[PDB]
């Protein structure tokens, strides 16, 4: 009894108090602001929702019996908060928290408000240990939310519901089927994108793609023809994961040129927060695909504390691939195949042999000028000299090297191509970035004039000084 | 104070990287720390070293001696308050902040120094404070400290000649520059071989000579070499007592490549275990070797590689693979043919090289400025 | 010793002598300006990112 009298009492009052201005005041201001004005995003308090989600994530009977049927009930809500606090201080409070929104005069008269209120129970119920709020009961609460979803008037409800049917997906993600979630999402997508433009063409796309790939079906038809590619309103958080998904989709189909740029943009759109969960994966792929595309080094050495422990296999891998040796590649694959399979990346790196052999032959071509093929096999350990002829021939085909070969003799001789400065390519190289440096100036200037505003102050010299000047001039002209 | 303590830091490193070296250093460092009341550098180092169970008596008596000294110092503070000159409290606290630094941690010494910097009205004592900060930063490798203190010293040194102080700053800046892999800057700032006193950071003038010749091997080419480091008798007379470095330099100058490699191996072995050269001791080596090749290939044009075996080191395949991996890197412009075992040379113009670095530095700066562009404006 | 630039042939003893254009002033100024603006951009952190 003595132990629980000094640290247990504090938990009750202080969190309630600091919540009274965190979500109670937030709800009160949103009701008269989001549902009281057309500021939308401004008075929608999506960042207040954000903060009250992130803080409560790492953080109900009183707040569920909120009443606002009449003005006295709405006024009462706030004194009833203190009344329930006093009851909690004196007495011990408590399914029976789902019928209250239909009772206790609960007439918010704003869907934007009752939605967030309902979702707030769902988030704790989702995070109620691993119980899943008695499983389907959380889903049933979200089934209630889905009934609310069909309620209507979306000058706020839309951007309120986004988060709702984003956690809704997580509910099934942690449990049972997802196929019928896909059916629902497909329907909901055209339920939107038809009410002119309403957004959600960002969140629903990511929700659909999150486990479309996880089920391991690489359908792409609708992605190339999707009209929701361009919501243009993503808060710079949705856009990153959307670009990541489309980049992996593009890269898995033997397309490397565009995936690098799009997914590098996606990675560099990532925020500054300490969490590095998805950045681990995007980095890992962003350097596998760069190894695949030609032989760009990618070895922009990463030793940051967060990423150091994870990417230890990959460092060893790049070490083998950069050199022309091939036994090292097998000695790495047979060692880390299971680890790569656990990462879902065995299929991409299993086709890396061609890149290794291209690097080796290019290095051999650049180093020597006249070498017998009776040693190329020994240096690259192909175990046979005759097929080295075919390998070199294929290399010459694609313009890898311009060396000729005397088949009757056996030695390979290479041409000499120097003085690239006179070639037209450096002009192209300069132009490609002249374009960028000209674009950035216009981009910067475009947004400079937005902050200058409220400059109504426009006065020249005076108002009544003109009469004094005229009088002085007349007096001077009189004499 | 921190005049003798530099070597202690060396020993710390000598017990970190050398695993086999764990016998004598742990003892000489130990009884160097037991005196002088050095309490700081073995809070965690005691964990790094052996358990050393028998220390609680020593720990207690040593920390109580520390407390006795500190309370004495407070006594003189209050004594100086009533009958003060230039606030002799501040004179005493400046005079004993170095004691606290010698015994305690960074926080107390740094705070005491930053507070006592305001009592001194003359430039000399300000410079002494700044030099104390440079020294502690060199101990604990605090880069921003080094940079800010160096720029403050340079902004304080133009008022008045202080050419001895200027030379001291030059030596400090050279020491910082060797730690970073900037070598040309070191060789330029290590041309103070006629103004280096028997300083407190390099016990040996001869060690200073060895460092400057080592960096001058890389930084500068043949005319300057042949003009400055071989025609300045002030270092020739010192080198007369150092046969190893003398023959090491003469081997490179006189093209006796056979004796060059043993000396190079000895030098790199010695500098592997030396401080402020280990972190990149391999890099250095991989320069000299390639440099030697560039000292021989430009005189001739069709030299056979067999000549290397009896002129540079036995082993045809070794030279073959070495030259191959050096050609692949983009340096040492030449070419080799295996069917007839011949080595040809070429003369690329000094334009293409003057182009690649331009394009790549432009790329990196453009990337950086794009990051700046998007990080601002939401 | 760079006093005389050419090339020596060991096969028969022919001293090929050639000359090269003056090393251009074109690019070292570009190089220094690039590093100078890099330093300016780096110094721009202390007033751009910290304040915003």
């Amino acid at each position: 009894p003595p132990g629980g009298g000094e640290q247990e009492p504090p938990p009750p009052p202080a969190p309630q108090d600091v919540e009274m201005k965190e979500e109670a005041a937030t709800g009160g201001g949103s009701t008269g602001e989001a549902d009281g004005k057309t500021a939308a995003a401004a008075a929608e308090h999506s960042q207040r929702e954000l903060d009250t989600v992130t803080l409560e994530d790492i953080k109900e009977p009183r707040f569920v019996l909120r009443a606002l049927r009449m003005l006295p009930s709405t006024s009462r809500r706030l004194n009833h908060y203190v009344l329930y606090k006093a009851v909690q201080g004196f007495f011990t409070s408590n399914l029976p928290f789902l019928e209250e929104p239909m009772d206790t005069e609960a007439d918010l008269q704003f869907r934007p408000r009752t939605g967030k209120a309902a979702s707030t129970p769902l988030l704790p119920e989702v995070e109620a240990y691993l119980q899943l709020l008695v499983v389907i009961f959380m889903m049933n609460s979200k089934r209630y939310k889905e009934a609310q979803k069909i309620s209507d008037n979306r000058r706020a409800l839309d951007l309120v519901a986004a988060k709702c049917y984003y956690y809704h997906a997580r509910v099934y993600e942690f449990l049972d089927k997802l196929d019928v979630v896909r059916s629902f999402l497909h329907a909901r997508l055209r339920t939107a994108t038809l009410r002119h433009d309403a957004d959600g063409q960002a969140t629903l796309l990511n929700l659909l793609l999150r486990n479309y790939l996880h089920y391991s079906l690489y359908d792409q038809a609708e992605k190339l023809v999707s009209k929701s590619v361009f919501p243009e309103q993503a808060n710079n958080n949705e856009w990153a994961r959307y670009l990541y998904y489309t980049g992996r989709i593009k890269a898995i189909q033997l397309e490397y040129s565009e995936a690098r740029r799009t997914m590098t943009n996606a990675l560099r759109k990532a925020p500054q927060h300490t969490a590095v969960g998805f950045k681990q994966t995007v980095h890992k792929l962003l350097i596998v695909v760069e190894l695949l595309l030609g032989e760009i080094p990618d070895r922009l050495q990463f030793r940051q504390p967060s990423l150091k422990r994870s990417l230890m296999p990959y460092f060893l891998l790049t070490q083998a691939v950069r050199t022309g040796n091939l036994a090292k590649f097998n000695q790495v694959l047979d060692q880390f195949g299971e680890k790569f399979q656990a990462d879902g990346t065995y299929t991409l790196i299993i086709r890396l042999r061609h890149n290794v052999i291209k690097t080796g032959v290019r290095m051999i071509s650049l180093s020597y000028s006249r070498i017998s093929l009776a040693d190329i096999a020994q240096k690259l350990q192909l175990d046979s000299p005759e097929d080295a002829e075919f390998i070199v021939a294929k290399a010459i085909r694609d313009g890898v090297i311009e060396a000729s070969i005397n088949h009757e003799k056996g030695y390979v001789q290479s041409k000499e191509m120097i003085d690239i400065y006179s070639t037209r390519e450096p002009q192209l190289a300069f132009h490609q970035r002249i374009s960028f440096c000209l674009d950035i100036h216009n981009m910067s200037v475009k947004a400079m004039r937005f902050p200058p505003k409220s400059y109504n102050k426009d006065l020249e010299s005076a108002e009544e000084r003109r009469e004094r000047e005229q009088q002085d001039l007349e007096f001077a002209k009189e004499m | 104070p921190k005049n003798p303590d530099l070597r202690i830091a060396q020993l710390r490193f000598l017990l970190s990287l050398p695993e086999h070296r764990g016998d004598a250093a742990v003892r000489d460092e130990l009884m160097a720390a037991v005196r002088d009341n050095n309490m700081a550098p073995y809070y965690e180092a005691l964990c790094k070293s052996l358990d050393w169970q028998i220390d609680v008596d020593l720990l207690n008596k040593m920390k109580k001696a520390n407390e006795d000294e500190l309370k004495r110092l407070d006594e003189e503070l209050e004594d100086a308050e009533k009958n003060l000159g230039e606030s002799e409290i501040r004179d005493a606290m400046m005079a004993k902040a170095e004691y606290l630094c010698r015994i305690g941690d960074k926080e107390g010494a740094l705070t005491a120094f930053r507070k006592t910097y305001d009592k001194t009205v003359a430039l000399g004592h300000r410079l002494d404070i700044v030099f104390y900060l440079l020294r502690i930063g060199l101990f604990y490798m605090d880069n921003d400290l080094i940079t800010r203190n160096t720029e403050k010293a340079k902004s304080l040194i133009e008022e008045g000649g202080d050419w001895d102080r200027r030379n001291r700053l030059k030596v400090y800046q050279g020491l910082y520059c060797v730690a970073i892999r900037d070598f040309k800057q070191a060789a330029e700032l290590f041309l103070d071989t006629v103004s280096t006193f028997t300083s407190y950071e390099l016990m040996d003038y001869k060690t200073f000579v060895t460092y400057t010749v080592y960096v001058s091997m890389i930084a500068l080419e043949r005319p300057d070499l042949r003009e400055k480091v071989i025609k300045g008798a002030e270092i020739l007379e010192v080198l007369h007592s150092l046969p190893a470095v003398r023959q090491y330099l003469f081997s490179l100058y006189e093209c006796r490549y056979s004796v060059f490699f043993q000396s190079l191996a000895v030098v790199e072995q010695e500098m592997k275990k030396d401080w402020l050269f280990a972190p990149h001791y391999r890099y250095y080596v991989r320069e000299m070797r390639i440099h030697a090749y560039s000292q021989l290939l430009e005189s001739y044009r069709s030299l056979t590689l067999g000549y290397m075996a009896e002129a540079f080191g036995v082993g045809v395949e070794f030279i073959d693979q070495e030259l191959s991996r050096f050609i692949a890197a983009g340096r040492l412009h030449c070419k080799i043919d295996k069917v007839n075992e011949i080595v040809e040379t070429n003369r690329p113009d000094s334009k293409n090289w003057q182009y690649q670095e331009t394009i790549k530095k432009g790329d990196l700066l453009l990337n950086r400025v794009q990051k700046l562009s998007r990080v601002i404006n939401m | 010793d760079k006093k005389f630039h050419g090339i020596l042939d060991q096969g028969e003893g022919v001293l090929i002598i050639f000359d090269e254009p003056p090393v251009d002033k074109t690019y070292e100024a570009a190089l220094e300006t690039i590093q100078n603006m890099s330093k300016v951009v780096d110094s721009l952190y202390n007033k751009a990112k910290k304040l915003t």
Binding site: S444, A447, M448, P451 | L365 | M37, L44, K47, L51, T52
Partner: peptide, 30 residues
């Protein structure tokens, strides 16, 4: 190339100045 680079960085500095000259003044109206 070089000139366009310099032009861009100067315009960037100008934008930074404008924005900080706004966010530290707009708050004065409460």
């Amino acid at each position: 190339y070089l000139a366009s680079l310099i032009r861009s960085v100067v315009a960037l500095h100008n934008l930074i100045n404008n924005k900080i000259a706004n966010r530290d003044a707009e708050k004065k109206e409460g």
